[PDB]
Amino acid sequence: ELDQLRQEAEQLKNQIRDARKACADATLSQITNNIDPVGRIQMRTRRTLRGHLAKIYAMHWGTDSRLLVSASQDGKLIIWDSYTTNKVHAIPLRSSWVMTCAYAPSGNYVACGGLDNICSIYNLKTREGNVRVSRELAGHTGYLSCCRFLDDNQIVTSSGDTTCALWDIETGQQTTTFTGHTGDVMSLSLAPDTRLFVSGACDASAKLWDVREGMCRQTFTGHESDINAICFFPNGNAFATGSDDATCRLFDLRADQELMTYSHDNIICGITSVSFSKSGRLLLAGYDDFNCNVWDALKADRAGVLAGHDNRVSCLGVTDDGMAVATGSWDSFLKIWN
Amino acid sequence: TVSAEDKAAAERSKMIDKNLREDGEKARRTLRLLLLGADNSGKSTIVKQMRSGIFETKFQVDKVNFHMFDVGGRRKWIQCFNDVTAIIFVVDSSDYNRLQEALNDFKSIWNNRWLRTISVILFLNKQDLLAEKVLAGKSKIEDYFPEFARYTTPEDATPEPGEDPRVTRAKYFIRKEFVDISTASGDGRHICYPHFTCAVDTENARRIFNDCKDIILQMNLREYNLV
């Protein structure tokens, strides 16, 4: 009976493979051949931020496009003013091992988490002129890998227990739990509408979830190893992923299939971070070789290189206005490029 | 061309920097270690000298100061500990059935790409249990390991007074297999320090201080260009 059900499962997978083959009329390469090339893109370091005394694991940009937050294993979180390179605040953390940080859209709160298995919220604006912890959220049985804020009272988190959750900050409890991965979850991205999100895991698969009904609409496959990074295209109808097999791939939600792969023979190291420009023409990635490569999304050709670090590049970000890019490293420094 | 309020903000930033520098100086006075074990090891009782995601212990010997971490809450989280002074690995010598599983785990840690420059201290626990099984003669290491029968204890090897020849051949045999993996891979970068221990033994903390003194000395010879 168990074996009989296993045969039924394979039959359904066979039907799924046939349907996506029928929709493969053409390739992205044959449609975009006539388009003229982007050119050569050269960028320079415009600012260097110094203060952390240990490797940096995460960073996030404010909606204003002038203020940013960074997290390091020295047990400290810092808020910076990019234009004047001044430090607005420094926050002491109870546990040294932190793997994630987030900035609220309102600008009134920040969040951090790690091997402690807890996500903590901090109130930036209060009388008494100090920053204090507001709530601590507990319930996950594995390390916290990523966290993002839907609103002042809503946050989504990912974990190494193979599960994701949505929380109510005032109550301190989880409204919904999303389950179905067989491997640790490493990354999360939220759509512009805020009605859907995508996740990537060590099982080499990515899933799309609906926030209101707690269900998995579609599953995507193709990579040969763990996926460490995920991002959403500006329209909201496509997404990009990066893995330790040294390749990056682009997927389309409506077609339900991979459109293109970005790879070169010289590159043999893994990819740690991914981001897109405001138009979506350029894709930016970070590598363990200490260098960041720029790619033309439409034609899959490398256009530039931005290398300024003596250790592994761990994080990347682009401003909402589109003016600048920020990078972080295990060398203890952050740089701004334009 | 500069505002009064802008000058005051810059003064606040300089004061924040002074506090961060002072906190960093406090860290260079302390040494950090990671504990790894398989649950039949008895790893928790190793340091009798002093005392969900992560657990910690603190102890001090001869004015130097030490902190130990156990993540009992491994491929992805081991990247964080690439700057620790040393890693402590514990095994139960008496269990013949689980010995091969322990050997495979050690090989993965020794050959990991983020732990290339980190040295390992190996503790072989339950040495009292091994002695009674060897003397009793009901259980034979030869059944689990075929090459043991064609083994002779090293000619220059010396054992503690009173220990039977049989125990000396068996103890030396189990120590040799782990040292073999260490010699085979990384060279000129890392050494394994092997010790045999029992639950009652109270000298474990002194042994760790001695091994760290060797680790710092070897790095200084490299920094000064002598070697």
Epitope: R127, E128 | S3, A4, A8
Partner: single-chain antibody, 229 residues
Framework: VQLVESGGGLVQPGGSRKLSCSAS????????MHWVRQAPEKGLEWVAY????????YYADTVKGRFTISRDDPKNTLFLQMTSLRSEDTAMYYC??????????????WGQGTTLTVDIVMTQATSSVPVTPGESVSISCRSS???????????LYWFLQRPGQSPQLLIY???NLASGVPDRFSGSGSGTAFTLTISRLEAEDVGVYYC?????????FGAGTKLEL
């Protein structure tokens, strides 16, 4: 948050006295502190400033050479030593707290005050405007030099003193509104000309309104305008 001040009384001319302020409910060390005085029937005038960390100290020309400012961070106290007193020194003195960082609101809290008995020019021409409940009013301030800076910020502040009490911040940096303040109040202007508009006037809006500049030291204030029913 509370600031309480003591040390005041009749003094003969040529004498000396020390005034003290005690702070509670907030982090005293992280905030810069100032002093201001109001003459018997006149308006607000600034006296001195001490920075957090005690790095920067500034003084008005009239009191320079005869007054000193100090702070004790462990005991949460601030002091003013005054020497060679003259008749012009009679007034009421107040303690004010200020913090400076991107997006901060300076001059937020003021103490009750103690009584002792012994440059950019800002002009608000109207001295009195009669008002009725339920109507909209506008108040205007003019400046000798433009308050707009190349950074893109214009530095002008508005305050209200209702009868029998200390001054309260209403607007900072021309357009921003302070916390705990009703949305009826609004501020607009250009370098050298500024306006504050109050809609749906109600009782409790009666008092004297003042304009101040923070572009450069010394800090200066306008004479004030009174709204009366």
């Amino acid at each position: 948050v509370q600031l309480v001040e003591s040390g005041g009384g009749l003094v003969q001319p040529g004498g000396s006295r020390k005034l003290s302020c005690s702070a509670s409910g907030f982090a005293f060390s992280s905030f810069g502190m100032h002093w201001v005085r109001q003459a018997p029937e006149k308006g607000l005038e600034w006296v001195a400033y001490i920075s957090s960390g005690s790095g920067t100290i500034y003084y008005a020309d009239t009191v320079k050479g005869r007054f000193t400012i100090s702070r004790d961070d462990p005991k949460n106290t601030l002091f003013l030593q005054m020497t060679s007193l003259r008749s012009e020194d009679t007034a009421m003195y107040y303690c004010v707290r200020s913090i400076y960082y991107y997006g901060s609101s300076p001059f937020d809290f003021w103490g009750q005050g103690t009584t002792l008995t012994v440059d950019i020019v800002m002009t608000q021409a109207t001295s009195s405007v009669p008002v009725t409940p339920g109507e909209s009013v506008s108040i205007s301030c003019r400046s000798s030099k433009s308050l707009l800076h190349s950074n893109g910020n214009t530095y002008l502040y508005w305050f209200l003193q209702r009868p029998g009490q200390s001054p309260q911040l209403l607007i900072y940096r021309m357009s921003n509104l302070a916390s705990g303040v009703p949305d009826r109040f609004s501020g607009s202007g250009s370098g050298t000309a500024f306006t504050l508009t109050i809609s749906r006037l109600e009782a409790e809006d009666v008092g004297v309104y003042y304009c101040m500049q923070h572009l450069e030291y010394p800090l200066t204030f306008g004479a004030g305008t009174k709204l009366e029913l």
